[PDB]
Symmetry: D2
């Protein structure tokens, strides 16, 4: 059911520091090659009063390239699909939780996302839009409790230089339990590739590949 | 606009570990005396597969009794009202964020809540319904960033004895900035007073009072 | 063995951000009334390049006043005494762990403290000495694992206004399994009463009293 | 001053849950190749009542293989050397801080370590010795505040299967402001190669190599 080329549609309902918004979009990519694009539009609550970059990683890990010897739990979960959840802990006290449902309808992935971000300092890089994209990252994954979990030390680049640090903790939950990998890593790199003036229309690109630790 | 007796209406859209639900209810109380009751009904996604106790403190701090010399920021915010946000950090890794809007319509408060809880162990006290209500608590509050913030070390009692610890961090944001207190404390005690077999209909009572530290 | 008036002697070996130091001092007070003073001298590594305030709460909870109906675990532990350990998590990323032994000799309490503080920003209030004492505080305690634990949301006042937040987690370990209390609170207020220009000689006063929650 | 082959001597004073101990040892390796071994002996406080694995990463990052295009801050710091500090945050609440000095004396590296670990559950994998070595890991490093910092999501393998998770935060402080790298990664794999029955004599091996993210 997962072809070499697949599209997706996504909808997000979110809030940051009490400001509510809705975003709709679509994307496409090559799930076995680990590459994809997305185009998002803020449909309610725009223009947003905070950094787009905190939203970018919430709009698709069925596209991660996996070697044959590492079980691809997220691809295996289809056609029914999987849910994923996440905590982002920002170094200045911002905290976000996210809950997401991934399904497949007549050959198109369907993503539904809910996002609540709180406790961002009003003068911090998020509310003041001082970020300039993510560094590429490396997630550490392992099985636990019959599901797949992963954590990442991520970083946003700052306009005036240096980094704004964010820890991700994610949980990927197949709708019916499928085969799990062991301890492994996923390398990712997400880019904002174009946008209008107020970031109410934004395009993204992501490359991601799973692997064993290099020393194994 | 805040009378000695006030009613409220509340609704919540929530999810815990990928399980979505909706709750609607109403309450009433004596905002200057610090006492109130609520009755909640699960309207979608019942019966809930997790402990009711994690939801109870999300259904009303306009009812806290304040001495004359501590500015009552939340009461002062009416008639327009205020928003509040919260992180709950559970000791076994569960994390919740909550975002809430409090308004006033023809003499009745109107509460709207969104809640996302993630990363609860499947065999832990929340998913296994092993909790038996909250200990009474004491929140430490202070002004910051033009708004009011507070934190609490809270604890759920466990059926088999002992406590399941949870840290609250809350942010109270008037819709138009009003006068702030300094550093102070709020003592609270929330009780589940009645419930049906599967906790799809639940009643609660809360008492809350603000004060200076006892040594001042 | 614990008289209405007791003296103590204290020695600390510590480090902060790689700067090593040693402090010796003495104190006295009324263990059943919850009041005590201390006088400390930096004996090696002075003058300290960081705020004295992070050290002040490491130089004596046998002096807390307890009502008859709450077991006074720390007093019961004598003559043999008890150990205590602590984590302080500062809001800007500084972290300290502390380990302490409390015993009795020559009718005097004897305190031995080791302290490691790391990850303080070089331009932060600790390394730049921008603090001016603690707010009074309220610790939440409970028994666990056959020992007594407590947590506190504390705050340092900033010289030019505002607060710098610090979470304390403490563990109190009697040398024999003397009786434990239940869930309860300790109110404390620590004051720096005098000091020389470079904080190489400092005097402190503390008041502390245990109690049930006020609504009980 | 750093030759193709270099020896080191190490001494550690530490404590875990109030149990004090001292360890001394020696090591050797190839700093430009990223390989080294160590042999440690517990000299006071043995046998240790907790898992050796929490100490193993405190006994040498001057032996990290760096490509020519990534400044090797730790090697550049010699002959004077560098200090490093660390927080380990364990998933069950254990917390350790570490402070270390690295110098060079008569052509040998000299390491001095102090370690304070607190808040480990008495029935947890550390106090019950249920661990069986670390997974290989990947540290995310970046410059900040004129020093080099890094974080790692690490895991101890449990004897009867599964993982016990630990987050490392480290700070590396050269004694003079030698050149810093940018954002980069270090892959490491540490092995216990042999030990006696009570872990009072232990031998270790480590491989470590720095690199850019693989997608760069």
């Amino acid at each position: 059911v997962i072809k070499e080329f697949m599209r997706f549609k996504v909808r997000m309902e979110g809030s940051v520091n009490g400001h509510e918004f809705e975003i709709e979009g679509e994307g496409e990519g090559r799930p076995y090659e680990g590459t994809q694009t997305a185009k998002l539009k803020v449909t309610k609550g725009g223009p947003l009063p905070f950094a787009w970059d905190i939203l970018s990683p919430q709009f698709s890990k069925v596209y991660v390239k996996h070697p044959a010897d590492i079980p691809d739990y997220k691809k295996l979960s289809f056609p029914e699909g999987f849910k994923w959840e996440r905590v982002m802990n920002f170094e200045d006290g911002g905290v976000v939780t996210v809950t997401q449902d991934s399904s497949l309808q007549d050959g198109c992935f369907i993503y539904k996302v809910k996002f609540i971000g709180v406790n961002f300092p009003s003068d911090g890089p998020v509310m003041q839009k001082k970020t300039m994209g993510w560094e590429p990252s490396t997630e550490r994954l392992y099985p636990r409790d019959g599901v797949l979990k992963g954590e990442i030390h991520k970083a946003l680049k700052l306009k005036d230089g240096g980094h704004y640090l964010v820890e991700f903790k994610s949980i990927y939950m197949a709708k019916k339990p499928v085969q799990l990998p062991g301890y492994y890593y996923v390398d990712s790199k997400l880019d904002i590739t174009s946008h209008n003036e107020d970031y109410t229309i934004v395009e993204q690109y992501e490359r991601a590949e799973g692997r064993h630790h290099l020393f194994l």
